Amino acid sequence: DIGIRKRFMTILDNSLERDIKERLYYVIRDQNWEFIADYPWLNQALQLLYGSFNREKELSLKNIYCLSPPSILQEYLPENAEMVTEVNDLELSNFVKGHIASMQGLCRIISSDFIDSLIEIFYQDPKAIHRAWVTLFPQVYKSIPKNEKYGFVRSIITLLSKPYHTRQIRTNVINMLLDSISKIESLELPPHLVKYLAISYNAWYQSINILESIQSNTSIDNTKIIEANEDALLELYVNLQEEDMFYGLWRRRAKYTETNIGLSYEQIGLWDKAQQLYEVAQVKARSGALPYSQSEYALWEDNWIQCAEKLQHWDVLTELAKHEGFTDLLLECGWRVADWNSDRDALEQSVKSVPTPRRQMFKTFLALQNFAESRKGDQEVRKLCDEGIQLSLIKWVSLPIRYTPAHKWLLHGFQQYMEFLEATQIYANLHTTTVSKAQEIKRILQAWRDRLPNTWDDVNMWNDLVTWRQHAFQVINNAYLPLIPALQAYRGYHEIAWVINRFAHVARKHNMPDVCISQLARIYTLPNIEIQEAFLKLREQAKCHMNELTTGLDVISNTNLVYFGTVQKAEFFTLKGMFLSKLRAYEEANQAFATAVQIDLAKAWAQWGFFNDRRLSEEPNNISFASNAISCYLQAAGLYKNSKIRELLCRILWLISIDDASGMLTNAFDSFRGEIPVWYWITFIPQLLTSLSHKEANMVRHILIRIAKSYPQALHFQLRTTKEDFAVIQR
Amino acid sequence: RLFKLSFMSVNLFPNINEVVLLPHLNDLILNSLKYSTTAEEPLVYFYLIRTLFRSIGGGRFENLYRSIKPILQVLLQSLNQMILLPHERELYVELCITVPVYLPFLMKPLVFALQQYPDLVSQGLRTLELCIAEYFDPIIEPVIDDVSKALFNLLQPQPFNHAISHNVVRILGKLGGRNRQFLKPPTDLTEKTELDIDAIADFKINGMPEDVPLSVTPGIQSALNILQSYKSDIHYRKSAYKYLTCVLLLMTKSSAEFPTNYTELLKTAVNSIKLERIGIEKNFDLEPTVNKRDYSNQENLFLRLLESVFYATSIKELKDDAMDLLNNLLDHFCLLQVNTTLLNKRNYNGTFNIDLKNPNFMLDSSLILDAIPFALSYYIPEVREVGVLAYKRIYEKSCLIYGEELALSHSFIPELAKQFIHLCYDETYYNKRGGVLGIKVLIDNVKSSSVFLKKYQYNLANGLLFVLKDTQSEAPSAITDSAEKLLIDLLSITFADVKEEDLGNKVLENTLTDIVCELSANPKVRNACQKSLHTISNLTGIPIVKLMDHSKQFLLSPIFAKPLRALPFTMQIGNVDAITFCLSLPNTFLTFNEELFRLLQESIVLADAEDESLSYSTSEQLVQLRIACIKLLAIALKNEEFATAQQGNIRIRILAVFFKTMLKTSPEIINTTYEALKGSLAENSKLPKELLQNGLKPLLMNLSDHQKTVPGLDALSKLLELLIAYFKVEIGRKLLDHLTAWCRVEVLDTLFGQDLAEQMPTKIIVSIINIFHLLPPQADMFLNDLLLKVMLLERKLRLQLDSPFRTPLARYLNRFHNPVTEYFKKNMTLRQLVLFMCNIVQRPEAKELAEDFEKELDNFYDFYISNIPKNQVRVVS
Amino acid sequence: SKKENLEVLCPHLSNFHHQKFEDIEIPGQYLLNKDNNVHFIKIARFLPTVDFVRGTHSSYRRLMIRGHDGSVHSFAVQYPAVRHSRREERMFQLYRLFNKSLSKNVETRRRSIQFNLPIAIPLSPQVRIMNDSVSFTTLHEIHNEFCKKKGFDPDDIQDFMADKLNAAHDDALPAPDMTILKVEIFNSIQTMFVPSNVLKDHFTSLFTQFEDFWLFRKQFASQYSSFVFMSYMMMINNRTPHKIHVDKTSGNVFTLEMPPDSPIFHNNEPVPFRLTPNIQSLIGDSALEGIFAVNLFTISRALIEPDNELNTYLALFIRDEIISWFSNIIENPQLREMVQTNVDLIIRKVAQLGHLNSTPTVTTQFILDCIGSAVSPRNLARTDVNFMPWF
Lengths: 731, 877, 391
Fold this sequence. Notes:
This is part of a larger assembly, with 3 copies of chain A. Chain A has 38 helices and no strands.
């Protein structure tokens, strides 16, 4: 109620001083009420602060790029002066009375009146209040005495402490004060880690502005305080998962030499090289270097953990986890173990112990994995286990507003929690119907074979799904494995090979290929020895490929079969030629490489062209050159579209440019006139104009005719700029 | 609610047919929007369409809409942007619901909607999900930034609805491979507008060491937000005004000093404005920086801080002080604008490129003048209504303080003119309408001193020109209606005084040439073009002879310069229709268009089947082109000696195409072609070839055997108006048994339960009996044959009190009045036949039959009284 | 004024745009290279509120266009220019072509490399339409606005910089006439004229929430990384604050205007690249020094990594650019020699920022040292006052 709110606050208003610094102190201490669920009465406090504001009615300033003058520009053009005297047209005189009388009445304005106005405005105005306290509360700090200011700064940090009891709870109350405190022009004397824990209360990023500001602000109060503020903000930017601040900050905050050197060595992804670099950083940290602080151990510490965490050797990491594991033993529980009781005691230990939903995720995970393993024992608590997602949502509205990559992890798990309950019925009905269904599971299996993450995302992520996939693929085998001898998936759940071959391409991509050996070894003992898994595995073994190549010839001599497709092997044969021509053995390689594609009937065919073109790069004689080029562009004609086929043409266009008036190569080009390049060939086209203008536009006339044919309007506009200029320069 | 009750029907029994709705269905919505385009509170007509959409699907009636859909979609989307208010967003957004399948055009508003309301959220959540086991792979949907912008903002755990989350997870994690697969580095930093950047005022307080400045008006965003909001407390609303009331006041209240010896000095300036060539002082002087967007930032505050007030005054309960301020604001701001005009007179009389003075660092009411009338093109047309009161009180004070001077013409108008000209050029429905009402109140106080009409002649004409042209079909026609009404009055007061072929110097010469060049685009553009043409030709002397002689030079070339088989014929033969709108003048290039003739022969001889007929819009244009071609071919024969003797009977070859137009079988085409061939063609000659014959005999075999239908019977009916002795009048009696053949009692067995109107044989039978309305006048055997077969049907129909044949009886007794009264006295006994007439005589088409029976009544009142002893039971009958 | 009625200033609508039709494909939306025009946009209806704005060096006329898509991808208008255009069109082709391959790599695309040179279509041989939209400003606008935030006439600095220099010639007779004075003048510049952190100052008022300045930090490194790699690898030499436009809502960098075998931008006449100190003061002392090196190093490693992809692409641009330069004369082997001679020269200069071989240098040293070397106030004072490097 408008009167009930106003009068009750007025009773507090009149029974007060009009002494702002007292009243602000009386605001800052002399009521510290919670009122915690809604809002502050900072509204009423600003009104209480306006209790000390004068009830004046002047309120002016001169900076709006101010308005017109009343009479200056009416006295700045002085030429044709009439300046009439008691001869006023009444339309001038009657109008001059009114607006001046309108000037006499309308401009009535007070400050206290607007103060009354903005108060009732702020009755329903949240974002104005966030503007409001940032307006006044800095200017109040001006009129304040220096000694009590230090006490008020303690009192303000104590005022920071008293709703640090009150769990008020993306709407800003502390953050409303905090950014209002953030631009107070450096009057926060200790509160370095005080803000750091305050950061996760609500609204991170408004705070982190205040923190990075003090680190530039020049104060020597302690080099410890310089080091401490350095530590706390180094957490928070890492806390928001922002990478480049963290590996950025410490490399510009280094003390040891390998500390600087390793920090860059790790953050680029050269993780193995960082470990040795951290190792000598550690051996020198067995030190005479006295002033080492908790970074240099702990930075070296988890670096060993991360290097342990990354590639492999999780058993040795479990061996590291034995006398250890705050939850790394539960991360070692993330390493594959289907011993239900042992995890259960671990889980109940873990469930005993704001981060770690992965706790409750794991707490669901094996419990889900157990419940269906008791074959059609249960699925209902798994639907109760969807409430774990319901807690898991509370994160994705805590700290950010934009898509800071906190999401980029927190989505990846939010993906999985549904994928679990998706699998749950998919598990049980498979346990049901086996007790047609090979196709029906092939739906949800191809679906989960589809819903696979981005190919450059994060090595930990693509691992963690590859883990959770095969554990289901085990139970997928575990139902299929008794039932087919029970009868007597036509032959073999070959499913995890797809998880295998994919991680293989990822591992070559994310660049630690030791685990590519470690995965390919595990592929060995499997059913489904028929052609389909063999055609996958030869595709896997070629992806798995001097000493390594001669072992590939040793792989060629006796391993799996020669009954399968020889084009895959001939690709290895021309790559063995590509290894042979890597030793400059051109002729033995290319003839085999030309025969390798000739059996195959094309990436090798372009590469064998490219090898013969690299042979042409070594041999400026046209004989190798025109022989390669017609083969290579035709191999590029054999090459796939929708790729970097454009650059393959571009070198070929450069090679056609590189002809340097050889002769008869275009007859090889015209005989090997290729199918549709155009939409791919569309980007190099303005260049293709100039060379066709320069020289030898035989197939270029053949090219551009079809090009403009099925590409109007892109041919048009530039050439209208071009060709009108071209003949005008020609004539 | 009736329609809402009607809506629940086929839902309630789906055994009760959607086939009941199915023909009226797809007809309805297309007319509904057509009537919605026509309406005068059309959101009502929109409000029905949702509800009628709101119960369908799962009764397979998909295939009906499969023609209709994109018309709905494209218009809705165009409406969807145009909505620009409140619920019509959400309603059109709710209208995004449809029956399943495709189209990314539907994908465009989805994210606009998937946070446009809480309300819709459940529905479209189903949509993209279902859009996500089939060809639902290749989705390139790149509004995916904003889709990401809403969808993550949707997910919010608290007490939000536990399902609302539960979908959103099942959405997002379903595509994790597509999760950030085009997420972008953030590309809306998007800040520090001058909806935010306030300044400060040197305030004071009771503890303060100095006049401690306090930053006024941070609240502007919310202060805007609170007042315009509907659900305000009146105290809260009044404060939102009262806080704004100090605010934009104080934007010049400190500068609002009342000058003393300026009233004479402005009267001296009035004499100095009465002076001209008032040269300025010798200055090549300095000038500071501006960065006038920062000034425009400060302007856009005072732009918005003003345009708020007019958009607040028209709101109720507080208009009183509002307008008083607004009068007083105009009292201040116009006077300063006069000083600014004098400042713009100091900033005038430059000579050639040498230098000037250019003082800086003030503000003025020029844009403030320029804003709010251009901001009268808004919603809440009371604000548009106060916008009329603006330019009134403007032009009131304009003539009050400067009169009707050319300096007074300099003083107010050209600001308000060129903006209103530019607003007329603008491209929103709601924006454009605010100009047009502004043009009218302008036209009152400008036609007196029409030198501005001399100034804006080819200007304001061109403003009208695009106004009918460019504005899209989203709008109701009232703007387009208000367009031509002022526009005919505009071409009135323009061509009101010069009435000879003598005063034809520059401006109207340039203006009419555009009007000639406009005549070729939209039919609604084309239609009032001629109406403005033939009326402006009608008065002020020079007719369509003289005016379209200049156009005869202008239309001698593009009648053949942009050739046929291209240059789409609707506008193109609209120019020939403009030449048909010039054919009422003597010279319309009235011969030698054999290129126009022979190509148009091939344009009609383009076959409607097995030809360029595999590629509803193509249907409507092929309706439009064939109608335009059939009109232009018929007008070519009807044109004076253009094709009357050219190649002999070009009309008969056009009648052969008109026979092919009869086989084209569109009723709307056939009504135009019959009325054109009746009302504009007159040929009485011979076409005895198989062209008449293969139309004549197979059409009756089509009706009798192939049952084809309502156009087919109406074709030979209009042929019976045309081809005298469409021979063997007994063929209709053979059609009558053929009508009896198509009306076997299986349709009566089909009639057990079903509506008889829906009986397509009865639909055939109504058309069959429509034909014998204008049979050759030996309809004596009609009296014997049909009337028994009608009654024998009717008892087999078990029908009474309402007939299919209410009109075919009504025409036949009109035409045959002598055997009418003959057989009526000859059937004087039987009551059932008598009542059949007694209903039909009550039907009002035959009128002489009634007075004839009014003559025969006193004869029959005797004759039955004579017949009194006959039967004693039928006598009682 | 700033706007006027554009197509209303044409009677085209009734003589030629009485054949306004055909709804042409979006202009140059085949140039942003992809496979084929699957759903390439179609321009629908020209906006009528044309704008014409004039900057410190030039003027631009602007034309919004709301299309069949329905969003104003407002291509802007450049009055005719010179064969620099025929050069700069060719160059903007080239750096585009690598940028997809820049997305092809892992850690570049995982950290969002995205080279980002804009599109610009010439339509006559006279007229050039660049794809410049609103709200993308350049530094000399701010740099003059910084000086004109005060009354500081930048010429009055330029006269005063010229004043003490001739005064060095007069009273005594020093040998490092430039060196001591430019050490003195840059200090005197940082004394009385433009200090640093004006760039930190104006852009800090620019966003409204500090996380956006924290966002505006994060972009403004990432583009200005690519200006360096555009600078060194093209061997560009002229950079001026009216030649680097920055995106005031996004954060990109738009950079226009970009024997010894006629070395036309082959050797660079002063050594370092652009690292201006007021811009460094806004660069964010740790993080740009954190990121930009790590940026260019990632740019160094991944782009040079695959097989000859630098080479055959450079075979296109360089064999062109020399044939332009010699015409500014031709030879069949000597061009191809000077091709491969310069091709090795740049690729080795690309490998100059290459690696540490076996002894782990912490960074790419030729990056890491030249990070200091462009930062070095001697080499910064060593160059001319053309680039306004006092700022």
